Amino acid sequence: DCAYHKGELVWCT
Amino acid sequence: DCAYHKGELVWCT
Amino acid sequence: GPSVFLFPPKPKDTLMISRTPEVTCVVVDVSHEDPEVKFNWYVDGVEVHNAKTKPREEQYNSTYRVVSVLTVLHQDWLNGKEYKCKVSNKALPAPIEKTISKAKGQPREPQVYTLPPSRDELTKNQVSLTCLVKGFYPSDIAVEWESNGQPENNYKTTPPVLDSDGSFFLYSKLTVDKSRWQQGNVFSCSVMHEALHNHYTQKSLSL
Amino acid sequence: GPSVFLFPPKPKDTLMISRTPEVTCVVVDVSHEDPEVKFNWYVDGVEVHNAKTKPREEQYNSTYRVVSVLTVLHQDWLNGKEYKCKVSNKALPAPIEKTISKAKGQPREPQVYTLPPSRDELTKNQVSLTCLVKGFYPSDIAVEWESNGQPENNYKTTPPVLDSDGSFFLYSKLTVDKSRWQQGNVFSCSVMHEALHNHYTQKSLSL
Ligand SMILES: *[C@@H]1O[C@H](CO[C@@H]2O[C@@H](C)[C@@H](O)[C@@H](O)[C@@H]2O)[C@@H](O[C@@H]2O[C@H](CO)[C@@H](O[C@@H]3O[C@H](CO[C@H]4O[C@H](CO)[C@@H](O)[C@H](O)[C@@H]4O[C@@H]4O[C@H](CO)[C@@H](O)[C@H](O)[C@H]4NC(C)=O)[C@@H](O)[C@H](O[C@H]4O[C@H](CO)[C@@H](O)[C@H](O)[C@@H]4O[C@@H]4O[C@H](CO)[C@@H](O)[C@H](O)[C@H]4NC(C)=O)[C@@H]3O)[C@H](O)[C@H]2NC(C)=O)[C@H](O)[C@H]1NC(C)=O
Ligand SMILES: *[C@@H]1O[C@H](CO[C@@H]2O[C@@H](C)[C@@H](O)[C@@H](O)[C@@H]2O)[C@@H](O[C@@H]2O[C@H](CO)[C@@H](O[C@@H]3O[C@H](CO[C@H]4O[C@H](CO)[C@@H](O)[C@H](O)[C@@H]4O[C@@H]4O[C@H](CO)[C@@H](O)[C@H](O)[C@H]4NC(C)=O)[C@@H](O)[C@H](O[C@H]4O[C@H](CO)[C@@H](O)[C@H](O)[C@@H]4O[C@@H]4O[C@H](CO)[C@@H](O)[C@H](O)[C@H]4NC(C)=O)[C@@H]3O)[C@H](O)[C@H]2NC(C)=O)[C@H](O)[C@H]1NC(C)=O
């Protein structure tokens, strides 16, 4: 599962 | 009335 | 004669997969008799040729500014690969070079802290919301403020300042209306860093 | 040839009637063959002559550094008098005039807020006492931290940061082991600045 900022993919792990 | 700063006079008024 | 500067990726362009980071090589003060500038890129001594050259734009001070720009990889900027430009020009005894790595030092992650406005500041028309970001290395970072999905605006963020045990810290002040605050809206401080889980964390703040 | 630099006095020296503020006119890069420097001074067009020359020095890169220091009246500087220093040296086609003086802009109070350490920091070993110093003008300011009569040691103050209303802010975070904080100690933030009453205030923190 992944990190979103302003709904824009940051980084997933 | 005066202000001091770590005991060293600052200003008076 | 000519002179050259090398520039890192934007913090946020390097820390999000959505975006693509670039290293940028600017060669100011290029002649116009001998405007022709040729580059060589190296990544850890290894030359690379997939690298574009930006439109050559005229400066109006009797010089040209020619820039080369080279895509890099999120994966291997944060790791430490050492990017190196390399300008050569006819107006120039030998090729010039500088090498822009990142910050040699263990990554250390930032703690985030949301400090409500002071009791003594509810008189004022507007109140200050505080974000304490402490204990991160390198100082490359991005910080923003949101509320209910929306990008809260009039804020302002101190520059990173070195902090005594090697680490870095900044603050960021959001200014809201005392009204909004007392309604109890949540305002979040959003923080991106290479040493964060998934590069991202977000902390909350509200009545 | 020579290159001169005019310097304000420390904002502790202008704001404290105990202290004694000085304008400092530094002529560096002074020749070896021709090290004679003349300083005319002007306090608003008015030439003044109570300024002394500090001792000649070599520096080690084959140039002298010559410095003229000028006393100023607190009152004078804090109002906005232009200080001029006119340097002349045989190694110079014409005298160099350098002229300083504090920020033109109506002085404005610093509002001063002690922010505690985030709930999420009882966890941590050392904690974060915070001082918000906003809404002040000019940016010339002095901020220190103390407890029970004594200066608190290890703190750090951000550079002034220009704000959207023309005014200025900065933060200061004192770091102090939970143990201390937890033991009821009172730490205080001592700001001194022009528009402040008696150029000094103090706000404090506890439990
Ligand atoms: C002829 O004109 C050109 C073009 O300039 C322009 O011409 C006309 C039209 C006017 O409008 C000008 O005002 C206009 O700007 C002149 O070129 C200028 O030359 C100077 C010096 O010769 C250069 O200064 C350097 O600037 C960098 C920072 O520059 C960035 O920011 C600018 C605004 O601040 C922006 O406009 C620049 O383009 C550049 O922007 C970065 O670009 C990348 C990619 O494009 C982008 O991703 C970034 O976001 C962007 N950043 C922005 C926009 O903010 C400055 O950092 C350099 O400083 C180092 O070197 C100095 C010694 O040369 C030293 O004094 C500095 O302190 C600094 O030193 C370094 O410090 C770091 C830590 O801080 C340390 O780690 C390093 O070790 C240390 N290195 C040392 C000491 O060597 C540098 O000063 C201008 O960039 C350049 N202008 C442009 C637009 O390129 C040219 O000089 C003119 N010729 C004449 C008049 O004869
Ligand atoms: C021969 O040697 C001497 C000394 O050698 C020095 O030490 C040796 C061991 C070597 O390592 C050398 O590398 C080293 O330099 C050389 O003298 C130096 O000369 C340069 C320029 O030639 C001077 O540069 C200026 O610096 C000022 C700031 O000066 C302070 O900070 C220094 C450290 O940052 C510190 O060492 C100085 O003592 C001085 O410190 C302040 O002093 C006051 C007065 O006592 C004190 O109260 C403060 O507490 C103290 N602060 C400290 C200690 O932190 C800098 O402001 C200048 O930059 C401006 O000037 C640029 C051009 O010079 C210009 O392009 C910039 O834009 C900027 O311009 C100004 O900006 C402001 C606001 O933005 C405003 O006024 C204007 O907009 C603008 N004004 C302009 C443009 O006129 C400048 O860079 C060095 O200070 C000086 N060193 C010393 C110790 O005096 C000498 O050059 C050598 N000769 C050679 C190599 O040929």
mmCIF file of C-alpha atoms and ligand atoms in Angstrom, chain C residues 5 7-8 10 24 26 28-29 54 59-61 63 65 67, ligand 1:
data_model
loop_
_atom_site.group_PDB
_atom_site.id
_atom_site.type_symbol
_atom_site.label_atom_id
_atom_site.label_comp_id
_atom_site.label_asym_id
_atom_site.label_seq_id
_atom_site.Cartn_x
_atom_site.Cartn_y
_atom_site.Cartn_z
ATOM 1 C CA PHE C 5 26.390 25.899 -12.097
ATOM 2 C CA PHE C 7 21.594 22.079 -9.570
ATOM 3 C CA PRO C 8 19.827 19.246 -7.731
ATOM 4 C CA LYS C 10 13.441 19.708 -6.573
ATOM 5 C CA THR C 24 20.322 20.808 -14.419
ATOM 6 C CA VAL C 26 23.584 25.907 -16.413
ATOM 7 C CA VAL C 28 26.012 31.340 -17.988
ATOM 8 C CA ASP C 29 28.151 33.942 -19.754
ATOM 9 C CA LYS C 54 17.239 23.078 -23.359
ATOM 10 C CA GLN C 59 20.265 37.022 -21.831
ATOM 11 C CA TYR C 60 20.483 40.601 -23.039
ATOM 12 C CA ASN C 61 23.777 41.222 -21.305
ATOM 13 C CA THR C 63 25.926 36.591 -23.273
ATOM 14 C CA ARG C 65 22.654 31.016 -21.248
ATOM 15 C CA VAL C 67 21.403 24.706 -20.123
HETATM 16 C C1 LIG E 1 24.777 37.777 -18.025
HETATM 17 O O1 LIG E 1 23.457 37.370 -17.625
HETATM 18 C C2 LIG E 1 23.459 36.079 -16.998
HETATM 19 C C3 LIG E 1 22.029 35.676 -16.789
HETATM 20 O O2 LIG E 1 21.432 36.390 -15.715
HETATM 21 C C4 LIG E 1 20.414 37.142 -16.048
HETATM 22 O O3 LIG E 1 20.708 38.176 -17.000
HETATM 23 C C5 LIG E 1 19.875 39.415 -17.062
HETATM 24 C C6 LIG E 1 18.782 39.157 -18.146
HETATM 25 C C7 LIG E 1 19.338 39.902 -15.672
HETATM 26 O O4 LIG E 1 17.914 39.803 -15.692
HETATM 27 C C8 LIG E 1 19.958 39.011 -14.547
HETATM 28 O O5 LIG E 1 19.550 39.415 -13.249
HETATM 29 C C9 LIG E 1 19.530 37.598 -14.870
HETATM 30 O O6 LIG E 1 19.548 36.750 -13.736
HETATM 31 C C10 LIG E 1 24.262 36.134 -15.701
HETATM 32 O O7 LIG E 1 24.199 34.872 -15.040
HETATM 33 C C11 LIG E 1 24.111 34.941 -13.636
HETATM 34 O O8 LIG E 1 25.415 34.727 -13.074
HETATM 35 C C12 LIG E 1 25.409 34.617 -11.646
HETATM 36 C C13 LIG E 1 26.858 34.583 -11.213
HETATM 37 O O9 LIG E 1 27.725 34.855 -12.305
HETATM 38 C C14 LIG E 1 24.628 33.369 -11.259
HETATM 39 O O10 LIG E 1 24.580 33.249 -9.841
HETATM 40 C C15 LIG E 1 24.685 31.878 -9.330
HETATM 41 O O11 LIG E 1 23.328 31.748 -8.892
HETATM 42 C C16 LIG E 1 23.042 30.567 -8.135
HETATM 43 C C17 LIG E 1 21.521 30.437 -7.909
HETATM 44 O O12 LIG E 1 20.900 30.667 -9.164
HETATM 45 C C18 LIG E 1 19.585 30.096 -9.308
HETATM 46 O O13 LIG E 1 18.657 30.998 -8.792
HETATM 47 C C19 LIG E 1 18.469 32.188 -9.615
HETATM 48 C C20 LIG E 1 17.746 33.200 -8.738
HETATM 49 O O14 LIG E 1 18.422 33.139 -7.432
HETATM 50 C C21 LIG E 1 17.826 31.734 -10.975
HETATM 51 O O15 LIG E 1 17.452 32.818 -11.851
HETATM 52 C C22 LIG E 1 18.918 30.894 -11.611
HETATM 53 O O16 LIG E 1 18.595 30.563 -12.940
HETATM 54 C C23 LIG E 1 19.171 29.661 -10.732
HETATM 55 O O17 LIG E 1 17.927 28.932 -10.679
HETATM 56 C C24 LIG E 1 18.060 27.478 -10.375
HETATM 57 O O18 LIG E 1 18.054 26.767 -11.636
HETATM 58 C C25 LIG E 1 17.622 25.398 -11.590
HETATM 59 C C26 LIG E 1 17.609 24.937 -13.028
HETATM 60 O O19 LIG E 1 17.426 26.037 -13.908
HETATM 61 C C27 LIG E 1 16.248 25.280 -10.924
HETATM 62 O O20 LIG E 1 15.929 23.904 -10.752
HETATM 63 C C28 LIG E 1 16.246 25.985 -9.575
HETATM 64 O O21 LIG E 1 14.968 25.951 -8.946
HETATM 65 C C29 LIG E 1 16.674 27.425 -9.755
HETATM 66 N N1 LIG E 1 16.638 28.126 -8.484
HETATM 67 C C30 LIG E 1 15.867 29.195 -8.275
HETATM 68 C C31 LIG E 1 15.034 29.648 -9.444
HETATM 69 O O22 LIG E 1 15.838 29.767 -7.192
HETATM 70 C C32 LIG E 1 23.793 30.732 -6.874
HETATM 71 O O23 LIG E 1 23.423 29.708 -6.014
HETATM 72 C C33 LIG E 1 25.250 30.600 -7.174
HETATM 73 O O24 LIG E 1 25.925 30.790 -5.959
HETATM 74 C C34 LIG E 1 27.137 30.112 -5.847
HETATM 75 O O25 LIG E 1 28.328 30.586 -6.447
HETATM 76 C C35 LIG E 1 28.697 31.938 -6.147
HETATM 77 C C36 LIG E 1 30.014 32.160 -6.822
HETATM 78 O O26 LIG E 1 29.786 32.202 -8.241
HETATM 79 C C37 LIG E 1 28.768 32.130 -4.636
HETATM 80 O O27 LIG E 1 28.965 33.473 -4.401
HETATM 81 C C38 LIG E 1 27.433 31.765 -4.022
HETATM 82 O O28 LIG E 1 27.458 32.025 -2.629
HETATM 83 C C39 LIG E 1 27.116 30.327 -4.311
HETATM 84 O O29 LIG E 1 28.161 29.596 -3.648
HETATM 85 C C40 LIG E 1 27.846 28.249 -3.335
HETATM 86 O O30 LIG E 1 27.045 28.180 -2.131
HETATM 87 C C41 LIG E 1 26.605 26.852 -1.801
HETATM 88 C C42 LIG E 1 25.700 26.979 -0.593
HETATM 89 O O31 LIG E 1 24.761 28.037 -0.737
HETATM 90 C C43 LIG E 1 27.819 25.958 -1.550
HETATM 91 O O32 LIG E 1 27.381 24.636 -1.251
HETATM 92 C C44 LIG E 1 28.736 25.959 -2.771
HETATM 93 O O33 LIG E 1 29.909 25.192 -2.514
HETATM 94 C C45 LIG E 1 29.113 27.394 -3.166
HETATM 95 N N2 LIG E 1 29.907 27.398 -4.388
HETATM 96 C C46 LIG E 1 30.878 28.285 -4.649
HETATM 97 C C47 LIG E 1 31.142 29.318 -3.588
HETATM 98 O O34 LIG E 1 31.519 28.254 -5.698
HETATM 99 C C48 LIG E 1 25.731 31.627 -8.208
HETATM 100 O O35 LIG E 1 26.015 32.819 -7.474
HETATM 101 C C49 LIG E 1 23.214 33.447 -11.820
HETATM 102 O O36 LIG E 1 22.542 32.209 -11.632
HETATM 103 C C50 LIG E 1 23.210 33.749 -13.321
HETATM 104 N N3 LIG E 1 21.851 34.006 -13.767
HETATM 105 C C51 LIG E 1 21.131 33.117 -14.454
HETATM 106 C C52 LIG E 1 19.740 33.527 -14.811
HETATM 107 O O37 LIG E 1 21.589 32.046 -14.791
HETATM 108 C C53 LIG E 1 25.692 36.524 -16.045
HETATM 109 O O38 LIG E 1 26.527 36.625 -14.893
HETATM 110 C C54 LIG E 1 25.685 37.852 -16.793
HETATM 111 N N4 LIG E 1 27.039 38.245 -17.131
HETATM 112 C C55 LIG E 1 27.512 39.455 -16.841
HETATM 113 C C56 LIG E 1 26.537 40.409 -16.211
HETATM 114 O O39 LIG E 1 28.660 39.769 -17.094
#
